[model samples]
Every structure is written in structure tokens, then in C-alpha cells.
Target: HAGIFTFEEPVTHVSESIGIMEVKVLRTSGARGNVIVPYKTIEGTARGGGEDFEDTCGELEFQNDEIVKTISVKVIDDEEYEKNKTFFLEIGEPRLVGRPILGEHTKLEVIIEESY
Candidate 1:
């Protein structure tokens, strides 16, 4: 079955220097396997925007080959005084990976805050 899944929530918030924004990709089928979901930053600058923070810009791999599990995005910390910064992490269509239904709730809106 071409199981459908989601990234828990479409939007999230994190304070600056909190360290990493871990998002869970859950499957509706609750099965086991590996999924290499390609993801990219569509908007915002929390990922190496030279203003707030930096993060990995590419695909995310959930390799288990036994049970489909969750993946994470490690947001790099930076020194800034800006507050309420924003960024977006979107899951792309399956391009040579596991059969993952993509469309709704695939994009994640990340809100970062700076605390002085």
C-alpha cells in the first residue's frame, strides 16, 4: 500500500539557541520500512540566512528497512538579537525513495525567537 503520512504539525516555534527542531514524520499505516523523503527550504532564513541561524538544506532519510520511523532536522544556533524569525521546511515528492503520499501538511513553518 502507498501509505500516507504527515509531519506531526504544519507549523512550529522554537526559541533561539534552543538547539535543534525535531519533527516527527508519522505513517498512517503504522508499518515498518525506510523512507527517503526529499525536503528543501522554500522560504525564510533560519537555515544559513546569515541573519538568524543555519540548517541542513537537502533531503531527509528515514532508514530502517524494517520499520518506518521518524527523522529530525538539526537547526544550527547563531548569535542574534532578532525576534520572531521564520523559516519553512517542505517535504518534496518521492524522487527515488519510499512511497510517501505528499501534499497536505508536508510543509513546516518554523518560527524562531531570539532571547537576549
Candidate 2:
């Protein structure tokens, strides 16, 4: 089987006051060696360029026995009693020393709220 990579969950809910959103990514196979997964933030109801989140993009480096990696999204504190907002984290093709397949849950929709 090929190396499969995806977000651990398809959707994430975070409190606006929590300060950070930790998105978990998981690999199901071809776990040996170094794997780099590229990702970027996409806009939704929440804009990325410092509206709801800081516009960001980079690669997650997974080296040697690391099956899970996390992407910490910098959530801006709007400090208003506004309604919830949403954004996206999209995973790009993974690179490394194996045949890697992008999993179905590659896109994670993150919701920002005050609670629940």
C-alpha cells in the first residue's frame, strides 16, 4: 500500500479566546523516512489575511517514526461578541521517499466560536 496522508478530522471547532488552533495530520502507511506535507489556509466566512486567521502556508516536516504532525494556526483575537466564523486548511501533495496518496480528509474546515 502507498503512504496515505490526511487530516485527523474533517472539521475542527475552536474557541475564539483559546488563542491557537492545533490541526492534527495523520499518516497511515509508508511511515519510514522523512515526509513533508505542504498546507495553506483558504478563506471562507473568515478571511485569512489577519481577519480570522493569519494567512499562512508551509510544509510540515515529519521525520523518522513520526506518524502524526500538527499545524498550529494563529487565530486572531477579534475580542467581539460576533457570531462564529469558518476557514479552511487544505493539504497539498506530500513529498518524500515513497508513493504517497492524498487521503479523503485532506481538507479541514475550522470553526471559530466563543464556546462549544
Candidate 3:
């Protein structure tokens, strides 16, 4: 139903320890039975900037850094998360495998304190 609409997830900061940012993990719809995107891959990372919602997720890594961090992982979902004082995540578009996905069909756990 969604053709190609751009959505911003709000700007988020990178982890001080994590000089490099990349998609550590992703769950795609193909896991179910769809043929659209059939693989969970770390396409790239979200570039560190002022932090603002955008169309795609960018990666951030220092000139020389080992620890890799990723933006736009998953947002704080469910009341349990709200009860824990959780908020924004890496900040990026939702996708499964390689195709853009939706939160309505998935639930992601966000470690607010661990992020940034």
C-alpha cells in the first residue's frame, strides 16, 4: 500500500564508544514467506550529523574505530517500553531484509540507556 513515502524518525546521537555505526541486525518480511526481500543484511550505517528524520538510515564511523554502532534499529514499542522511560532509537526508516517495512507488523526492543 505504501508506494515510497519518506519518514523521519527524529535525529538521534551516536554512541561515544561506538566510533563506527552500522546495521547490526534487521528482520525482514521475507522471513515469513514474501519474496520481496529475502535476506537480513546490514546495508550500511547512518552518518552522524545534527540528527534529523530522513528517508534512509545512514552509517557513522570514525576515521579509526573498531566498535560499530547502528542507527535506526528499532523504536521503543509497547507500553512496557513506555513504562521503562524509553524513547527514540537509532533513527531510520523501517525495513525488512531490503524492502521498507512497517512497525505495525513488528515489535522492536530499544535499549534507551545503551544507545548514544
Q: What is the TM-score of each candidate against the true structure?
A: 0.70, 0.88, 0.22
5-100 per-residue lDDT for model 2 (tens digits)? 999889988887777778888888667778789999999888788877888799988786788888888988864677798999999998875466
**Regarding lDDT, does 1 or 2 come out ahead?**
2
Q: For each candidate, what is the lDDT?
A: 0.61, 0.83, 0.28
- Residue-wise C-alpha lDDT for candidate 3, range 1-116, written one tens digit per residue: 21111222323344323323233323322233221212121222321122221223343321111222234333221222121222233323433223434333222222232332
User: Candidate 1 residues 27-92, lDDT tens each?
Assistant: 565334555667666447554544455454565555443233444555556555655768887776
Q: List the candidate 3 regions with Cα displacement exceeding 4 Å.
A: 1-15, 29-100, 104-116
By TM-score, the best candidate is 2
Q: Name the runs in model 1 displaced over 4 angstroms.
A: 30-34, 45-51, 62-71, 76-79, 95-99
Q: Pick the candidate with the highest lDDT.
A: 2
- Model 3 TM-score, all chains together: 0.22
TM-score of 2: 0.88
Winner on TM-score between 1 and 2 is 2
